[PDB]
Amino acid sequence: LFPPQWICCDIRYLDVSILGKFAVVMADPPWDIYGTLTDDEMRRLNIPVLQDDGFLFLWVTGRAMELGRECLNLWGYERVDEIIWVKTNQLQRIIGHWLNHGKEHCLVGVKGNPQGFNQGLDCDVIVAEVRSTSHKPDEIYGMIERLSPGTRKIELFGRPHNVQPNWITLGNQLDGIHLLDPDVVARFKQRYPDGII
Amino acid sequence: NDYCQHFVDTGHRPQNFIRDVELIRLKDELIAKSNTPPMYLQADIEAFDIRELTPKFDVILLEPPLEEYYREKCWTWDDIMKLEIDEIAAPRSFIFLWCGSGEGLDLGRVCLRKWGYRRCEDICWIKTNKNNPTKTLDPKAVFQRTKEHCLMGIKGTVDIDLIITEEPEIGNIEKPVEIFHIIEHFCLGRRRLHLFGRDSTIRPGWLTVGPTLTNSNYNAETYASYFSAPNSYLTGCTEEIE
Numbered sequence A: 001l002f003p004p005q006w007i008c009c010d011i012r013y014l015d016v017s018i019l020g021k022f023a024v025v026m027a028d029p030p031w032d033i034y035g036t037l038t039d040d041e042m043r044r045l046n047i048p049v050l051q052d053d054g055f056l057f058l059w060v061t062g063r064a065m066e067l068g069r070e071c072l073n074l075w076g077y078e079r080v081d082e083i084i085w086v087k088t089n090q091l092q093r094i095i096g097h098w099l100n101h102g103k104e105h106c107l108v109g110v111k112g113n114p115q116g117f118n119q120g121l122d123c124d125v126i127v128a129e130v131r132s133t134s135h136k137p138d139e140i141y142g143m144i145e146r147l148s149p150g151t152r153k154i155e156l157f158g159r160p161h162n163v164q165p166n167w168i169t170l171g172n173q174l175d176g177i178h179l180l181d182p183d184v185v186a187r188f189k190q191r192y193p194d195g196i197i
Numbered sequence B: 001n002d003y004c005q006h007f008v009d010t011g012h013r014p015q016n017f018i019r020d021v022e023l024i025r026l027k028d029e030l031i032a033k034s035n036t037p038p039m040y041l042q043a044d045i046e047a048f049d050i051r052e053l054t055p056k057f058d059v060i061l062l063e064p065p066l067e068e069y070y071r072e073k074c075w076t077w078d079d080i081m082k083l084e085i086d087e088i089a090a091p092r093s094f095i096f097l098w099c100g101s102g103e104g105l106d107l108g109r110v111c112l113r114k115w116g117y118r119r120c121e122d123i124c125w126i127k128t129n130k131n132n133p134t135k136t137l138d139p140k141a142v143f144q145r146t147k148e149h150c151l152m153g154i155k156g157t158v159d160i161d162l163i164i165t166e167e168p169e170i171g172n173i174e175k176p177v178e179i180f181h182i183i184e185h186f187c188l189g190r191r192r193l194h195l196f197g198r199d200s201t202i203r204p205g206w207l208t209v210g211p212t213l214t215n216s217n218y219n220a221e222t223y224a225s226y227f228s229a230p231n232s233y234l235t236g237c238t239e240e241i242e
């Protein structure tokens, strides 16, 4: 079901096995560098059930630059790329205690044998204006769409602005449960007959 | 304006459109005044006992020639990881490690931990292509690689983390001289080592060691003399002591 879908929930306790497999997973987790997850909770997240072949996009900062690599590898991925977003203002000028930070990082992991992807279409630098606090740039969805067009995708720890066609968004600040894919709707009713998690 | 779409359309990398890419010039003068004379040594570092380099360094810049630098003797991460960097670093010291853009972003972190550092900054050399708007991808690459990372590590107790310059010519392996400004502005100390530097990177305030150097002037005791008292603990950002 192409139009946006989402599930308000605590990603720790939701049974993600009901959602099927995704060509792309993206996550912007609350690392314990305000709703944080501990390193063990992050390690235990059931990312491995979500894909057999495809890509993982994992936003990282501070010590999660290292801890995100750990989770990525533990979850069964190999880091094959790292996107950086150069944060600019409206005049295309650039906006960790040793250096000032002009950028945010997003690791790119591959799992299995993905085929039918358009590798090489985008480059690994994003230049885009800062919207809000902790808001990631919308350009990442265009890059992800060109890499794997039309496929089903899932975002963990998304916010309401992050919902997108072809994406299912999980996050604890979304407004309720909105699901349209019939295979998912079935497995959700079966696993959650009273609609609570 | 979607600059990722614009790059897909035109071949112009998004960094091409960053614009602009009071008086921190006294600091520079003080750096220039306290700088030791340049010193340098031709050495084949695989065959070379690293302990011969004394004293222990406050700052180590490490720039191994990765195979990926030669797109059109290279060092693998295997070779690099077996370097005994911990034996020549001062107990409180810093490292800056050029990691390229591939597996080095992972293996370079292994090296930093192996030698006793933790990463405190990730510095990105972002390469524009204003003067030539295609790249031959590493097989594992999902995206076109238009940057390189220099990891900063610390062991023991003004600038941004971006360098933007135009992508050098095919087979030019030089890194932007701006990395030296960033390092020197940190005021980390005056014992500064550049491993795998070249004739073209020799620089005041630095000891350069590499296989392609054509001349040497390194002497252990002469080099130590620059840091004997009353100069042992200078940041390299203060006046020389009278």
Ligand SMILES: O=C(NC[C@]1(O)CCCN(c2cc(NCc3ccccc3)ncn2)C1)c1ccc(CN2CC3(CCC3)[C@H]2C2CC2)cc1
Binding pocket: A009, A010, A011, A012, A028, A029, A030, A034, A035, A036, A037, A059, A060, A061, A104, A105, A133, A134, A135, A136, A137, A157, A158, A159, A170, A171, A172, A173
């Ligand atoms: O606010 C956030 N994201 C929505 C939540 O929804 C909110 C609330 C907790 N969060 C959860 C947490 C959860 N379970 C644990 C729990 C439940 C209830 C109480 C306490 C703890 N389940 C579902 N969402 C996320 C958020 C916070 C920080 C950042 C960092 N960014 C910004 C950055 C810049 C480019 C992108 C990136 C960065 C590179 C590293 C991003 C998003």
